[PDB]
């Protein structure tokens, strides 16, 4: 089989305050069977507490400090084959 | 009290698949929620399930501007002045001739045992405007799937196992069918709300609270009262009824400035889950568009969305669709775009306050009533009721009549013709045939049952009425190089009851 | 279209309660959610309602692989070759001796004036093995109960009220009875789920909106943009109906490292809340066990669980038990252990952006489809549905056929023979009796209808069948000592329908 | 107790031999084993003698699981739709056209006169699936053979002799046969050895 | 995929006559329908000649073809117990379904369907 490919509608997300949620859709993801996990994962941000590291295909995140992150999404085959992409979040405060 | 419709159109079928059954998925890679499995057929089939596949836009509103309800009764259909022709191209020419000899084979799903396609809001039927010429759909369909792939009671029908009618220049197929008591589909609007039933002038001898506390010297102090409701606390009368049930949907505005600038037309959208995948709703339970004077509203997937003559198939801007909005329904059924009403929460006490939660899901309550989805000239007629053990309130979310028995998919196909054969016997397959169409006339004569308008108010109704100004073109008619355009959606509900 | 069963057996009745109506209550100390009030009587009940009780698991094999639907038409039940013992110990010996003098009394309770229990999922049936002999269980019924204490409206019912038949050995008892009109049963799966209906061939004349923002220099803009649903983007058809309803259960695995480390049996459980009091819904609305290619895991309180032979009443490990599980379903039904869908919470704007929420319960809304719990070979086959004013769509929960007027209740009674009285007049009770017991043959015959499968698929289906390979013990049979044994629970969904 | 299976099919007959009988044999050299002395003939034959050119594979699986015997009892065989095409190539291209005056020739043998072939599993059945089209088999048969060579017993069948029908596009051919009574094939196992 | 009928030979004697291939072995099993184009001279030449005609019009034809078969049927009546062996699919995923036409329109049937499921004694 082929392995999936991950896909995030968002790369650029550009949020700032009061704005505190975000949002990343990995739904998208597609491959020739069906995909069975999800993983997100901050690579790197604001040094925080409230963090996902969730397993679902659709990302909320909440309590959203400003900074720069970055989620790096990957999906799972039937046959244990994997895919990754990063997606691109930034957070400005009040102007 | 009754009304007849009769269409006749020219169509074109081509043979499709070359003849052949496929297989056909999203085995190419697809996310879970558009996987799919099933088989494309080479044949094809008639779909007149649209309501100006058999209403001119004046009989439409002749209908709707005397009628309270409506519903069809019986159809005849033809299939007339058949002709196959064989298509040969040689040095980069094009003949075409004509066969006599050739068939078409017709086979009539009375028994429904294909699946039934037709009530899926297909582009295919008998176009609105008779001197248009239209090209028959290939039938397809879907079974069980899990991803790409299929599971063992996934089915695969083979059309030709069936008993079919073979046709052959000159021969014609008739067929009759009557439709079974179906509910009227309800073509007013209601001149009174549900929360408005009163009689103003009269006071309710039924009590409710009026109110929790009352001054004791500089604060307040716990104490209950009780009034009676007239007409100046009328939002706190004892009432009967309640408005229909609700899914909640996000709101969207037709003035692009009043959006979010973000991407939610997926991830903010109304879904439904099941067997671990996701749909969207659309449209969903009939809610109205939207409350009084906010017309540039309406629910992200809660209303039928048509498109304007010539606009394209994706990602198309707004002043290229018609967006229909009801908001006739708004006396009974509750607002797509807000909730449902509020519910308590908690138990309140001397050190607890009260609090309450919005309900954005509210499923049926013994004493809720509503009105369904509007049908327009240019929506659905009819769809199949699934075959289920339980289905309540069995229309149609898309609108129009649920149909446990709907008028049978009629498939047809182009009988193959083999080109020359080899002179040495060869078991394979044949592959190799003589390149054919066919075409011919198709008529569709329905039926309508009507509940003529008997209104005794006083003052003159609202009713559907062309623009009396002048136009570069007239609605409804072709334009300067011949092409017919729809350009409104054309709703049921001018005429007016009460609750 | 017909096919009837006959089940005979052997029961032996003791004397319950040595003759005496006793009053019974949780009042030695229960929690709130168990606490009760009734009454144990001395009479025995006759139950014949699992499907075992009836059909041989051949006859049930016959039925499920070659049926669409069936239901119950009528029963004949007999009692007969009766006869009572009476059981004297003198110097810690065992007599036991045949009297033709004694009777039995047998109380056929058709008119429903008291508590039916049959219907409660209770272990006491004619056995599943014709050659097994069985103890005729004790009848007992609870009423109105505020704590361990009974209110003014709790009933007490003594059956001696009624006028029962008296039998004898050789007298026999004969009892007819016919169903009322009840839906079919669906023993099929679906081959199409609900949310594929459509032709994947042809795109949909409807509009959906596909985007919402869109590129503008180097940031985005808010655009609204729509297109017309095809294959590719399946999941965004406009579709005519919706899933069941759904009341959210938790989700535990087969696999005890799955699960988590703690008890949340209750804690964690689907309730429903009653006067003050908590129960566990079980097996609560009809939904599908779990998703596609996750049979390891099942709903905490949502299928029906049946024991292995032999298997003890408390704390009993997975392996013990038989876990159903309803994937057959997951075509229409929502899975039991995720959300319904998702429903929209605000309104967006320019500063605010969509927000959603999944929904863990969904009562029934206009346009949804479902398909009611399987029926098992081991499993009930009637309830009485509730006198009530309301009752949406009566089908048990438990599975099987809502009757408004079930099999009456059978209850039998040895008629109490007193011992040897005091020759001098006494007004007390008489508390001394003559120990016996009855014992004799009871014979059910049901007569039921069938709706034979008429697939015209091409493809072989799915049917249920005996493993091919060798094994120390034959299923469905007698082991090396005499012990019948059910290896397995099985359904009635094999055959296949297209929705 | 009674199943109807029912068939249909498109089949397309070519020309044979360019009309003529031919005398077939292995005097190209072969084994003893392999030698034989035949004819090919101009005719092609109609073969349904395979249980998928009328059950189903569903069909199949009903009648399987749920009987302990059945046995052919009648069978209506029919033509129809028929027409002929001729086939015209000038400067190196391929014409086809419809002639309506031609016909076809049908020759049913129910008196057995000629050698029998159906009964040696040959493939020209038709197509199991009913959307295959098929090309019908050219009828030929054996005789006595000594090596490669004929001997005097060794017959010459031209079908012309016998009576045929002629089916020009428009005419249909219909022919209906009952069996005889056949034992009814054992679709069961033992559970006893 | 199997064989119906074969016709029993004419000889004089053949014992217990049930096809080796498997079978009904007929006395008189359904008749060859044989078929052929009836041969259409093309042009002949204006001056007689007795020699065989030679050229002809090339040709073929085509049709519709229906075969129809009643058969008769002994219902299975078993009064055994336990459950019996059936004919069944394969009830697991799978990339084609059996006895189905492929991506490209090819049918196959994937294995040889015998008739013994149901069990009798001896
Ligand atoms: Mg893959």
Same mark, same amino acid.
């Given at each position: 089989?082929?392995?999936?490919?991950?896909?995030?509608?968002?790369?650029?997300?550009?949020? =700032?305050?009061?704005?505190? =949620?975000?949002?990343?859709?990995?739904?998208? =993801?597609?491959?020739?069977?069906?995909?069975?996990?999800?993983?997100?994962?901050?690579?790197?941000?604001?040094?925080?507490?409230?963090?996902?590291?969730?397993?679902?295909?659709?990302?909320?995140?909440?309590?959203?400090?400003?900074?720069?992150?970055?989620?790096?999404?990957?999906?799972?085959?039937?046959?244990?084959?994997?895919?990754?992409?990063?997606?691109?979040?930034?957070?400005?405060?009040?102007? | 009290?009754?009304?007849?419709?009769?269409?006749?159109?020219?169509?074109?079928?081509?043979?499709?698949?070359?003849?052949?059954?496929?297989?056909?998925?999203?085995?190419?890679?697809?996310?879970?929620?558009? $996987?799919?499995?099933?088989?494309?057929?080479?044949?094809?089939?008639?779909?007149?399930?649209?309501?100006?596949?058999? /209403?001119?836009? %004046?009989?439409?509103? %002749?209908?709707?501007?005397?009628?309270?309800? /409506?519903?069809?009764?019986?159809?005849?259909?033809?299939? !007339?002045?058949?002709?196959?022709?064989?298509?040969?191209?040689?040095?980069?020419?094009?003949?075409?001739?004509?066969?006599?000899?050739?068939?078409?084979?017709?086979?009539?799903?009375?028994?429904?045992?294909?699946?039934?396609?037709?009530?899926?809001?297909?582009?295919?039927?008998?176009?609105?405007?008779?001197?248009?010429? &239209?090209?028959?759909?290939?039938?397809?369909?879907?079974?069980?799937?899990?991803?790409?792939?299929?599971?063992?009671?996934?089915? &695969?029908?083979?059309?030709?196992?069936?008993?079919?009618?073979?046709?052959?220049?000159?021969?014609? &197929? *008739?067929?009759?069918?009557?439709?079974?008591?179906?509910?009227?589909?309800?073509?007013?609007?209601?001149?009174?709300?549900?929360?408005?039933?009163?009689?103003?002038?009269?006071?309710?001898?039924?009590?409710?609270?009026?109110?929790?506390?009352?001054?004791?010297?500089?604060?307040?102090?716990? %104490?209950?009262? /009780?009034?009676?409701?007239?007409?100046?606390?009328?939002?706190?009368?004892?009432?009967?009824?309640?408005?229909?049930?609700?899914?909640?949907?996000?709101?969207?505005?037709?003035?692009?400035?009043?959006?979010?600038?973000?991407?939610?037309?997926?991830?903010?959208?109304?879904?439904? $889950?099941?067997?671990?995948?996701?749909?969207? +709703?659309?449209?969903?339970?009939?809610?109205?568009?939207?409350?009084?004077?906010?017309?540039?509203?309406?629910?992200?997937?809660?209303?039928?969305? /048509?498109?304007?003559?010539?606009?394209?198939?994706?990602?198309?801007?707004?002043?290229? +669709?018609?967006?229909?909005?009801?908001?006739?329904?708004?006396?009974?059924?509750?607002?797509?775009?807000?909730?449902?009403?509020?519910?308590?929460?908690?138990?309140?006490?001397?050190?607890?306050?009260?609090?309450?939660?919005?309900?954005?899901?509210?499923?049926?309550?013994?004493?809720?009533?509503?009105?369904?989805?509007?049908?327009?000239?240019?929506?659905?007629?009819?769809?199949?009721?699934?075959? *289920?053990?339980?289905? !309540?309130?069995?229309?149609?979310?898309?609108?129009? &009549?649920?149909?446990?028995?709907?008028?049978?998919?009629?498939?047809?196909?182009?009988?193959?013709?083999?080109?020359?054969?080899?002179?040495?016997?060869?078991?394979?397959?044949?592959?190799?045939?003589?390149?054919?169409?066919?075409?011919?006339?198709?008529? +569709?004569?329905?039926?309508?049952?009507?509940?003529?308008?008997?209104?005794?108010?006083?003052?003159?109704?609202?009713?559907?009425?062309?623009?009396?100004?002048?136009?570069?073109?007239?609605?409804?008619?072709?334009?300067?190089?011949?092409?017919?355009?729809?350009?409104?959606?054309?709703?049921?509900?001018?005429?007016?009851?009460?609750?």
């Amino acid at each position: 089989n082929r392995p999936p490919i991950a896909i995030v509608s968002p790369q650029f997300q550009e949020i =700032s305050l009061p704005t505190t =949620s975000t949002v990343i859709d990995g739904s998208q =993801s597609t491959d020739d069977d069906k995909i069975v996990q999800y993983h997100w994962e901050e690579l790197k941000g604001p040094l925080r507490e409230e963090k996902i590291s969730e397993d679902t295909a659709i990302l909320k995140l909440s309590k959203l400090v400003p900074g720069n992150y970055t989620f790096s999404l990957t999906v799972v085959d039937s046959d244990g084959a994997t895919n990754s992409t990063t997606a691109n979040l930034t957070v400005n405060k009040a102007v | 009290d009754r009304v007849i419709t009769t269409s006749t159109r020219t169509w074109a079928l081509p043979t499709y698949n070359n003849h052949l059954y496929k297989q056909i998925s999203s085995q190419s890679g697809a996310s879970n929620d558009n $996987h799919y499995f099933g088989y494309s057929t080479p044949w094809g089939y008639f779909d007149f399930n649209r309501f100006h596949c058999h /209403f001119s836009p %004046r009989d439409w509103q %002749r209908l709707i501007n005397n009628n309270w309800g /409506f519903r069809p009764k019986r159809l005849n259909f033809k299939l !007339f002045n058949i002709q196959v022709k064989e298509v040969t191209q040689n040095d980069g020419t094009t003949t075409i001739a004509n066969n006599l000899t050739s068939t078409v084979q017709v086979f009539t799903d009375s028994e429904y045992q294909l699946p039934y396609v037709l009530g899926s809001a297909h582009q295919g039927c008998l176009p609105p405007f008779p001197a248009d010429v &239209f090209m028959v759909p290939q039938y397809g369909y879907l079974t069980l799937n899990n991803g790409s792939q299929a599971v063992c009671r996934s089915s &695969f029908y083979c059309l030709e196992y069936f008993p079919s009618q073979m046709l052959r220049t000159g021969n014609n &197929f *008739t067929f009759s069918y009557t439709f079974e008591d179906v509910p009227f589909h309800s073509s007013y609007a209601h001149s009174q709300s549900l929360d408005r039933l009163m009689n103003p002038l009269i006071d309710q001898y039924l009590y409710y609270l009026s109110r929790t506390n009352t001054p004791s010297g500089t604060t307040t102090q716990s %104490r209950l009262q /009780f009034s009676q409701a007239g007409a100046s606390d009328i939002r706190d009368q004892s009432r009967n009824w309640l408005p229909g049930p609700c899914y909640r949907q996000q709101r969207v505005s037709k003035t692009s400035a009043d959006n979010n600038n973000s991407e939610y037309s997926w991830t903010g959208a109304t879904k439904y $889950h099941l067997n671990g995948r996701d749909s969207l +709703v659309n449209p969903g339970p009939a809610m109205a568009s939207h409350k009084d004077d906010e017309e540039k509203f309406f629910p992200q997937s809660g209303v039928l969305i /048509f498109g304007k003559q010539g606009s394209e198939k994706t990602n198309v801007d707004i002043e290229k +669709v018609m967006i229909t909005d009801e908001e006739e329904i708004r006396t009974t059924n509750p607002v797509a775009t807000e909730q449902y009403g509020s519910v308590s929460t908690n138990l309140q006490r001397g050190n607890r306050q009260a609090a309450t939660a919005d309900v954005n899901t509210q499923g049926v309550l013994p004493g809720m009533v509503w009105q369904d989805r509007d049908v327009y000239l240019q929506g659905p007629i009819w769809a199949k009721i699934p075959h *289920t053990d339980g289905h !309540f309130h069995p229309s149609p979310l898309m609108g129009g &009549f649920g149909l446990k028995h709907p008028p049978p998919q009629i498939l047809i196909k182009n009988t193959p013709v083999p080109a020359n054969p080899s002179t040495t016997f060869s078991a394979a397959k044949f592959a190799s045939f003589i390149t054919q169409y066919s075409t011919g006339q198709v008529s +569709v004569e329905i039926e309508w049952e009507l509940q003529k308008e008997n209104s005794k108010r006083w003052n003159p109704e609202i009713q559907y009425t062309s623009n009396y100004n002048k136009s570069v073109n007239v609605d409804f008619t072709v334009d300067t190089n011949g092409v017919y355009s729809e350009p409104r959606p054309i709703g049921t509900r001018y005429l007016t009851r009460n609750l």
